[PDB]
Nucleic acid binder design. Structure first.
Ligand SMILES: Nc1nc2c(ncn2[C@@H]2O[C@H](COP(=O)(O)OP(=O)(O)NP(=O)(O)O)[C@@H](O)[C@H]2O)c(=O)[nH]1
Ligand SMILES: N[C@@H](Cc1ccccc1)C(=O)O
Ligand SMILES: [Mg+2]
Ligand SMILES: [Mg+2]
Ligand SMILES: [Mg+2]
Ligand SMILES: [Mg+2]
Ligand SMILES: [Mg+2]
Ligand SMILES: [Mg+2]
Ligand SMILES: [Mg+2]
Ligand SMILES: [Mg+2]
Ligand SMILES: [Mg+2]
Ligand SMILES: [Mg+2]
Ligand SMILES: [Mg+2]
Ligand SMILES: [Mg+2]
Ligand SMILES: [Mg+2]
Ligand SMILES: [Mg+2]
Ligand SMILES: [Mg+2]
Ligand SMILES: [Mg+2]
Ligand SMILES: [Mg+2]
Ligand SMILES: [Mg+2]
Ligand SMILES: [Mg+2]
Ligand SMILES: [Mg+2]
Ligand SMILES: [Mg+2]
Ligand SMILES: [Mg+2]
Ligand SMILES: [Mg+2]
Ligand SMILES: [Mg+2]
Ligand SMILES: [Mg+2]
Ligand SMILES: [Mg+2]
Ligand SMILES: [Mg+2]
Ligand SMILES: [Mg+2]
Ligand SMILES: [Mg+2]
Ligand SMILES: [Mg+2]
Ligand SMILES: [Mg+2]
Ligand SMILES: [Mg+2]
Ligand SMILES: [Mg+2]
Ligand SMILES: [Mg+2]
Ligand SMILES: [Mg+2]
Ligand SMILES: [Mg+2]
Ligand SMILES: [Mg+2]
Ligand SMILES: [Mg+2]
Ligand SMILES: [Mg+2]
Ligand SMILES: [Mg+2]
Ligand SMILES: [Mg+2]
Ligand SMILES: [Mg+2]
Ligand SMILES: [Mg+2]
Ligand SMILES: [Mg+2]
Ligand SMILES: [Mg+2]
Ligand SMILES: [Mg+2]
Length: 393
RNA sequence: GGUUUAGAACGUCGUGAGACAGUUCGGUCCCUAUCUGCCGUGGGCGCUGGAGAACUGAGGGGGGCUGCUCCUAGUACGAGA
């Protein structure tokens, strides 16, 4: 909180996706040390990406950490996702804000169950583009074995409905590029080139009014409570009226400084992860899931009609019918929430793989409008995608 | 220290003397080693002229405990942990 962030080079939200213990977090560390040395940006290190007691004694990552590496064309903002089956909820928040992923499949093990689960969540939420990275390579000194893993990833993406064969697969060791090997430093400099080439300039919504979903809340010692998240639409000027809408009720507030990776900003534009400092709010009373909207634009609702598309076994979801009283988890912008289903008259049962509308009473109210996209999940897996039809409350 | 002598007390049983793995406080533990055995340490003669050294080895004894840290490798194994 000192150096003013100059608005130069387009902002893009990147992040690593893939199986557990697969080089996902270690890739993030390799990208920093490679790009910092040659181009001449800020250095950083691997330990900073995940410290705490929970990511040392174990080794695994839980929290969605963030990194800021710069290149001549664009200014990237990384989002290192967790990866394990237990941490899918706090991942989806990291994956939703992310524009273009970096998938991580490995040349020894290959595509494994979570890789399929991650990319499934990527489609239904919103992950336009994806890039593969083989994160072992050196351990198996062979030409035929390593190239057979590439084939199965192209199959995976194309099977699940991505380009597949068009996606630029890259090979490279994360640990070798951490030290100073000239051949492996250049091969992850190549990944930065693939990020610029394949992923285009993202399409922002800097016109329609302000909204910002809260991904994580902080309490800065001196300044006050801060909320982080990608600005979904509009802009944020310093000293502007902001209404916090969602769970519990609704509270009035004002912004007192927006930032971008511990650097000051004047205008927090759309499509970029920013830490908004709110005035006169406690750490406990503001929770995760709520949205920073402009006063009057959005209203919290506990009941709504919605055109729900239930999934079948082939697409990946339920395989049995259900009646009124069923309670799955509804993932809106960031958080999830439970809700009772009330079906329309003249519909006895809801079969899997079917398009119908339904009234859904939620236990917590969440800020929503007509034409909001959500993805229903239950039992550690997906259920059905859909859209909001009408407001009731 | 306990049990198992003589003192004294409690509860209990006995008319009483007293009695009770019922309890309670106090209450002398001797021996210079002949033989066997054992640990040491010598004298005697033998081993075939005597003497001084240096070995050989039959045979006998000694010793044999094991942690955790890292490296292999977060490798195999595992959906993950
Ligand atoms: N030999 C070799 N090992 C690698 C390479 N890249 C990563 N690894 C190792 O693979 C392990 C995975 O660690 P990490 O990347 O933190 O796990 P992750 O991919 O973020 N998944 P999660 O966070 O869910 O546990 C580490 O031991 C790391 O050193 C590589 O190119 N070669
Ligand atoms: N936009 C934020 C992203 C972030 C969130 C939470 C922790 C760290 C980083 C910067 O800083
Ligand atoms: Mg493994
Ligand atoms: Mg990780
Ligand atoms: Mg592990
Ligand atoms: Mg394995
Ligand atoms: Mg396997
Ligand atoms: Mg204040
Ligand atoms: Mg006695
Ligand atoms: Mg007595
Ligand atoms: Mg007597
Ligand atoms: Mg009598
Ligand atoms: Mg007696
Ligand atoms: Mg007795
Ligand atoms: Mg008694
Ligand atoms: Mg007693
Ligand atoms: Mg006594
Ligand atoms: Mg006495
Ligand atoms: Mg006594
Ligand atoms: Mg006595
Ligand atoms: Mg005495
Ligand atoms: Mg004696
Ligand atoms: Mg004597
Ligand atoms: Mg005597
Ligand atoms: Mg004797
Ligand atoms: Mg003897
Ligand atoms: Mg002897
Ligand atoms: Mg002797
Ligand atoms: Mg002798
Ligand atoms: Mg002799
Ligand atoms: Mg003689
Ligand atoms: Mg003789
Ligand atoms: Mg003689
Ligand atoms: Mg002799
Ligand atoms: Mg003879
Ligand atoms: Mg002879
Ligand atoms: Mg002789
Ligand atoms: Mg002679
Ligand atoms: Mg002689
Ligand atoms: Mg002689
Ligand atoms: Mg000798
Ligand atoms: Mg000798
Ligand atoms: Mg003998
Ligand atoms: Mg011998
Ligand atoms: Mg021996
Ligand atoms: Mg022995
Ligand atoms: Mg040992
Ligand atoms: Mg290890």
């Amino acid at each position: 909180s000192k150096e003013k962030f100059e608005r130069t080079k387009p902002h893009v939200n990147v992040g690593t996706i893939g199986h557990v213990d697969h080089g996902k977090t270690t890739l993030t560390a390799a990208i920093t040390t490679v790009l910092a040395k040659t181009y001449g940006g800020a250095a950083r290190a691997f330990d900073q990406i995940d410290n705490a007691p929970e990511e040392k004694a174990r080794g695994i990552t839980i929290n969605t950490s963030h990194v800021e590496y710069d290149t001549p064309t664009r200014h990237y903002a990384h989002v290192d996702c967790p990866g394990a089956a237990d941490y899918v909820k706090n991942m989806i928040t990291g994956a939703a804000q992310m524009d273009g992923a970096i998938l991580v499949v490995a040349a020894t093990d290959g595509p494994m169950p979570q890789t399929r689960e991650h990319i499934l969540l990527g489609r239904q939420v919103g992950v336009p583009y994806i890039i593969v990275f083989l994160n072992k390579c050196d351990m198996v000194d062979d030409e035929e074995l390593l190239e057979l893993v590439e084939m199965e990833v192209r199959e995976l993406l194309s099977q699940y409905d991505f380009p597949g064969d068009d996606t630029p697969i890259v090979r490279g060791s994360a640990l070798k590029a951490l030290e100073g090997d000239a051949e492996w430093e250049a091969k992850i400099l190549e990944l930065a080139g693939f990020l610029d080439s394949y992923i285009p300039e993202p399409e922002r919504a800097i016109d329609k009014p302000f909204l910002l979903p809260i991904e994580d809340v902080f309490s800065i010692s001196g300044r006050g409570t801060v909320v982080t998240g990608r600005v979904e639409r509009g802009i944020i000027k310093v000293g502007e009226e902001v209404e916090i809408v969602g769970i519990k009720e609704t509270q009035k507030s004002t912004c007192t400084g927006v930032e971008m990776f511990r650097k000051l900003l004047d205008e927090g534009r759309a499509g970029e992860n920013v830490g908004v400092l709110l005035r006169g709010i406690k750490r406990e009373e503001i929770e995760r899931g709520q949205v920073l909207a402009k006063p009057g634009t959005i209203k919290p609702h506990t009941k709504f009609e919605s055109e729900v598309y239930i999934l079948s076994k082939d697409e990946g979801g339920r395989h049995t019918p259900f009646f009124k009283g069923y309670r799955p988890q509804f993932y809106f912008r960031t958080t999830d929430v439970t809700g009772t289903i009330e079906l329309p008259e003249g519909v006895e049962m809801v079969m899997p793989g079917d398009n119908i509308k339904m009234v859904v009473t939620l236990i917590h109210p969440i800020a929503m409008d007509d034409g909001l996209r959500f993805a229903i999940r239950e039992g550690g897996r997906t259920v059905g995608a859909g859209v909001v039809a009408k407001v009731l409350s």
